[PDB]
Amino acid sequence: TSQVRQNYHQDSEAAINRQINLELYASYVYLSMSYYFDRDDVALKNFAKYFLHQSHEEREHAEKLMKLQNQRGGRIFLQDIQKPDCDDWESGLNAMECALHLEKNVNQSLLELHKLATDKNDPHLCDFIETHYLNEQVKAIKELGDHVTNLRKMGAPESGLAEYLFDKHTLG
Amino acid sequence: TSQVRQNYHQDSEAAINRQINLELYASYVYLSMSYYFDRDDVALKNFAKYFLHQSHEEREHAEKLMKLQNQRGGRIFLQDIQKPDCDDWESGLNAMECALHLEKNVNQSLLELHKLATDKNDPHLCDFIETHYLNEQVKAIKELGDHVTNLRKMGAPESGLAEYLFDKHTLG
Amino acid sequence: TSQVRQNYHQDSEAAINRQINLELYASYVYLSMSYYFDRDDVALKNFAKYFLHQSHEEREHAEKLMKLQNQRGGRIFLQDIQKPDCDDWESGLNAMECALHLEKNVNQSLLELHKLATDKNDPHLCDFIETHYLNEQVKAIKELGDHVTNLRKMGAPESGLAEYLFDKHTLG
Amino acid sequence: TSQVRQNYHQDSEAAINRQINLELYASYVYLSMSYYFDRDDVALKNFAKYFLHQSHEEREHAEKLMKLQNQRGGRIFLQDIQKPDCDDWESGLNAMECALHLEKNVNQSLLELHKLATDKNDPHLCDFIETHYLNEQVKAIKELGDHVTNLRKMGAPESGLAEYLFDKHTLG
Amino acid sequence: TSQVRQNYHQDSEAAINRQINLELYASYVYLSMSYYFDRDDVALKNFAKYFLHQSHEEREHAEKLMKLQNQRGGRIFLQDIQKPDCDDWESGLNAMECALHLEKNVNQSLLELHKLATDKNDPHLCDFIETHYLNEQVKAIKELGDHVTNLRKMGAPESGLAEYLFDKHTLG
Amino acid sequence: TSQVRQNYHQDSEAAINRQINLELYASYVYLSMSYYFDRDDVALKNFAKYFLHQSHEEREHAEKLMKLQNQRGGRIFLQDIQKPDCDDWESGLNAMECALHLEKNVNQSLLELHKLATDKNDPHLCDFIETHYLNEQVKAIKELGDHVTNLRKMGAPESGLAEYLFDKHTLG
Ligand SMILES: [Ca+2]
Ligand SMILES: [Ca+2]
Ligand SMILES: [Ca+2]
Ligand SMILES: [Ca+2]
Ligand SMILES: [Ca+2]
Ligand SMILES: [Ca+2]
Ligand SMILES: [Ca+2]
Ligand SMILES: [Ca+2]
Ligand SMILES: [Fe+3]
Ligand SMILES: [Fe+3]
Ligand SMILES: [Fe+3]
Ligand SMILES: [Fe+3]
Ligand SMILES: [Fe+3]
Ligand SMILES: [Fe+3]
Ligand SMILES: [Fe+3]
Ligand SMILES: [Fe+3]
Ligand SMILES: [Fe+3]
Ligand SMILES: [Fe+3]
Ligand SMILES: [Fe+3]
Ligand SMILES: [Fe+3]
Known part of the structure; x- marks a missing residue:
């Protein structure tokens, strides 16, 4: 048992681990969407930027939960990052x-x-x-x-x- | 035979000469397209800029091959620059x-x-x-x-x- | 078939897709190592930084291959990112x-x-x-x-x- | 007939087209001379610069006539750019x-x-x-x-x- | 066998060693030429500078190959640097x-x-x-x-x- | 006999030539030591810097003697630069x-x-x-x-x- 662990339940620790995985998956989904709009037959370069930035943000949300887990004395357990739902x-x-x-x-x-x-x-x-x-x-x-x-x-x-026009005016 | 020529085949030299001509032609095609969009009954001034800039770029690609040919000891042989395919x-x-x-x-x-x-x-x-x-x-x-x-x-x-709208937002 | 595809073999496209997955996995492995050294019973904060930075670099190597795939007219197909080999x-x-x-x-x-x-x-x-x-x-x-x-x-x-001492002097 | 055309004779329009071609040819001749003096067995780098600059100037004289033709409501008709007179x-x-x-x-x-x-x-x-x-x-x-x-x-x-010495002192 | 060696053939390693020696020799030849033109009965101080700089460049080409050899896991083996061909x-x-x-x-x-x-x-x-x-x-x-x-x-x-005059105008 | 030679004995001239060779050899020895410490199984990057700098210094001591020899009217005679004593x-x-x-x-x-x-x-x-x-x-x-x-x-x-620790604190 960790020397810094205090008031930190085994169930919360498992839940935090499941949330880290969800944030990584969300990061992966956005990365997948980003490069969909970078295709030459789609060609919406600001949709691609919007989703690439959301991709980087979600992995920073995951890293913060990994930091919290170590902060509280739990142990990070990583699972497979599922491939996203769609290719198109x-x-x-x-x-x-x-x-x-x-x-x-x-x-x-x-x-x-x-x-x-x-x-x-x-x-x-x-x-x-x-x-x-x-x-x-x-x-x-x-x-x-x-x-x-x-x-x-x-x-x-x-x-x-x-x-x-939405690409140029709202996302650009 | 050139005092700097080394490992430079007669076939490569001819091919480089044919590529110089192709780049010049490409420069000519873009120059022709540029001033199509400058016509008063077409009037898309950023299409014209986009293609005038591509025209200048292709002639700089040609000049680089002419430099390479002299660099390697070959001899530049220039051909007619064919008039482009279309007028409209x-x-x-x-x-x-x-x-x-x-x-x-x-x-x-x-x-x-x-x-x-x-x-x-x-x-x-x-x-x-x-x-x-x-x-x-x-x-x-x-x-x-x-x-x-x-x-x-x-x-x-x-x-x-x-x-x-494409003229104003993508090319401007 | 893609309007930009030229001299791009179906086998290369599949290989590029398998390399994207490998770079993501490498990114995941480094992310896992990073937060190992952030544990309170390990506590080597510059090992953790070194590997977090390597983690971010590998995902940027993956993003570049995704860009290349779209550049050449292929289609990105993503696979599961396997959980890393070790937890400790x-x-x-x-x-x-x-x-x-x-x-x-x-x-x-x-x-x-x-x-x-x-x-x-x-x-x-x-x-x-x-x-x-x-x-x-x-x-x-x-x-x-x-x-x-x-x-x-x-x-x-x-x-x-x-x-x-290696943490302080080489990695700091 | 062009909506901007005024006092612009069919003969002038043809003459302007023949002058555009002459300026392009002059540009081509100078480009050819430039890279003659870049040869390793000629090696007069300021002759080459002098003529490369004259080459760029003549194409800018051609572009101005193309602009004038559109300005007056005529139609640019491009001809082959003849290969220059000499290779040496x-x-x-x-x-x-x-x-x-x-x-x-x-x-x-x-x-x-x-x-x-x-x-x-x-x-x-x-x-x-x-x-x-x-x-x-x-x-x-x-x-x-x-x-x-x-x-x-x-x-x-x-x-x-x-x-x-002329290369160094007059053209340099 | 080196822990970093990968896809690095024994023949390439020997060839790299022979190329290091050639670059050093080239450095020595230029050093010898440089101080020929520094003689009081030759007295061309910019020939001397031109060749002293080429001398320093060739040793930097040698050092880069030594770096490559260590980078790939081979072992540098140095040979005598032959005295140059001429004294005059x-x-x-x-x-x-x-x-x-x-x-x-x-x-x-x-x-x-x-x-x-x-x-x-x-x-x-x-x-x-x-x-x-x-x-x-x-x-x-x-x-x-x-x-x-x-x-x-x-x-x-x-x-x-x-x-x-070549000393003053081309090399100065 | 040189027009600038004065009070410069044939024996001193030979001795200066033998000292130029010794300084070059010393430069070579240090260059060899430098890239020993750049090996992946040695990996002391500041030993390598220390000896690379000593290598460059000794060749500058050699160049100064070559300058002195020309200054006094003697003739530089270069010998082979012997390969250093050790590889490891x-x-x-x-x-x-x-x-x-x-x-x-x-x-x-x-x-x-x-x-x-x-x-x-x-x-x-x-x-x-x-x-x-x-x-x-x-x-x-x-x-x-x-x-x-x-x-x-x-x-x-x-x-x-x-x-x-000596690498980090004394040589770094
Ligand atoms: Ca799956
Ligand atoms: Ca024709
Ligand atoms: Ca290459
Ligand atoms: Ca698995
Ligand atoms: Ca007037
Ligand atoms: Ca002809
Ligand atoms: Ca010998
Ligand atoms: Ca020997
Ligand atoms: Fe978000
Ligand atoms: Fe989130
Ligand atoms: Fe282009
Ligand atoms: Fe081109
Ligand atoms: Fe890396
Ligand atoms: Fe990588
Ligand atoms: Fe002119
Ligand atoms: Fe003109
Ligand atoms: Fe050189
Ligand atoms: Fe070299
Ligand atoms: Fe010293
Ligand atoms: Fe010394």
Whole structure:
């Protein structure tokens, strides 16, 4: 048992390990989406930038949880990073919709993590989730909801003009 | 025989001369396209700039091959620069499509040049083609493929609004 | 078939996809090693930095291959990123030894990739491997060999004083 | 008929097209001379610079006529650019003599162009020729006459010392 | 066997050792030529500078090969550096002619080294030769060919005025 | 006989030539030692720097004697530069010990050179040896004696920790 471990339940430690894996997967999904829009038959270079940056952000969210696990005296256990769901996301509107879906599932996982730490009476792990992840998730979901709404109101996915102009004006 | 000539085959020298002519022709084609979009009944001033700059670049690729020929001890032999294929490229989408076609043919010529220097065992001429021309070609073809894709997805050539907006936002 | 695809063999495309996965795995291995040395019962903060930086570098090597695949007209196919080999690398000397081993295996894969592109007569893909990956690998392997040698000559792994001083003076 | 065309005779338009071709040819001749003096058995690097710069200038004179043609509502028609007259201009004195000859022929063409625009009563095209081409030609011919005179008085072409010193002091 | 050695053939290692010796010899030859022109009965101080700088460059080419040998896991074996061929190179034109000859022989050795690495399937050692030595050699030979041509056309070696003026204007 | 030669004995001239060769050899020995410590199984990068810098210094001592020989009207005669004594100097302590030995032998040669110039009554050559070489030698020998003493008192050659720490703190 770790010399720094205090008030840190075996269940929280396992949950933190499952959340690290989820953030890595989210990083992988965004990396996959990014280079979809870099294809010559898609060619939306700011969608690609937007998702490459989201990819780098999610791996920084994972690294922070790895830091928290060592901080609290638990042991990181890594699992396979599953290959993403799709190889061909049709359109810019479909990608933002998958991203919105993915960000809600991550949020749901974080809310369950917070409920477990409330019940294990771990106030430090609670504040960590609140301070670094919960408001980030709410802001990400609101941003992606906005993007999805603009893309629909513009006429996407059937109008490539709409998707082209959204690339230049919102994401550029 | 030249005092600096070493490991430089008569066939490579002829091939370099044929490649100089191809680059000049490519320069001429782009010059012709540039001033098509400067016509008052076409009036896309950034298409014209894009192609004038490509015109100047191709003549700088030709000058570099002339420098290489003197560097290796061969003798430059110049041929007529053929007048380009078209006087009226219909639309911006049609010009990028001809440019994509032209850039692939130049690439194909460069790949054949590289195969001949491999077989004549001229590693310096191989590295020269690799370092200065091969990745340039791959980047040019990918750029033009992107432009062609955006123009189609926007509704060109039937939508002059699409071509107008591409001029302002991608090429400006 | 892609409008930009030229002289790009189905076998090279598959090989590039297998190399992207290998670089991601290497990135994952280094990320795992990094946070091993961040544990409170290991506590070598510059080993952790050294490997976190190597982790970020390998994912940038992967992103470049994804860019090359789109550049040449192939299609990225992603596989699961396997969880790394170990959860507990004993010592700093053992980690540098695994890293040396991993970097040789990546090199071997790159040399086989280069042999396949030579035989498919793809000089652009050859120069890409030479210019961006081959000398990087040779420099990485020489660096890790040096680290392993210093750690042994100092008295590692049995001397934690040796490992402590190497952390401060070579990696800091 | 062009919406901007006014007082612009079919004969002037054809003459402008023939002058564009002449300027391109002049650009090609100078490019050919430039890389003659870059040969290792000629090796006069400032003759080469002098003629490379004249080459770039003549293509800028051609581009200006293409701009004028679009400005006035005519249609550019491009012809083959004939390969230059010589592959081996013997000496620096012989090249300046060919350049002097070429510049007089261009001047003669410009004077005939000006006579046709006088007779077609096109005062704008007259002023354009006067303001941008006529004094340029007179200055070029006087410069080349000076160079030819100095080279002869120095002892060229039989004295390579003379040609060497002219390269360093007048053209450097 | 070295812990970093990978795909590095015993024959390449021996060839690299023979090339290190050749570069040192070339450094010695240039050092010898340099201080010939520093003699009071020769007294061409810029020939001396030109060759002293070439001397320092060749030893830096040797040091780079020593670095490559350690990089790849081979073992440097040094041989005697033979005293140069001449003690009295007659004239500036004769020295540039020996230097031209020496630089072609070094090039020939490098081309044979590249052929051996092609046949041993060592693409890293191939790119190293291409990237650091092959174009350097081509540029050196072209420079020395130019110098030799100017010196002859000026009237060297019988005209010490020619050699004096070349010292001041080309090499100063 | 040289127009600048004055009070310069045939014996001094020969001795200066033998000293030039000794300095070149010393330069070669240090170059050899430098790249010993650059080996991956030795890996002491500051020993390597220390000896590479000493290598460059000794060749600058040789160049100064070549300058002196021309200054006085003698004729430089170069001999083979013998390959160094060892290919594998065991340890850092053993290299500093060979370097100490080599520097004393060079000093002894310089003292004999000074004795010959005293007896040939060449006060200029005496002051040259005193002003540029004699105090340099005394300072080099004292420095190397210090290094050897520290390395022994630290526990070298049996302690690679000692050699590692000396590399970082004294030579870095
Ligand atoms: Ca799976
Ligand atoms: Ca024709
Ligand atoms: Ca698994
Ligand atoms: Ca290459
Ligand atoms: Ca013709
Ligand atoms: Ca007027
Ligand atoms: Ca000998
Ligand atoms: Ca010997
Ligand atoms: Fe996000
Ligand atoms: Fe996240
Ligand atoms: Fe281009
Ligand atoms: Fe080109
Ligand atoms: Fe690495
Ligand atoms: Fe990598
Ligand atoms: Fe001109
Ligand atoms: Fe002109
Ligand atoms: Fe050189
Ligand atoms: Fe060299
Ligand atoms: Fe010294
Ligand atoms: Fe010395």
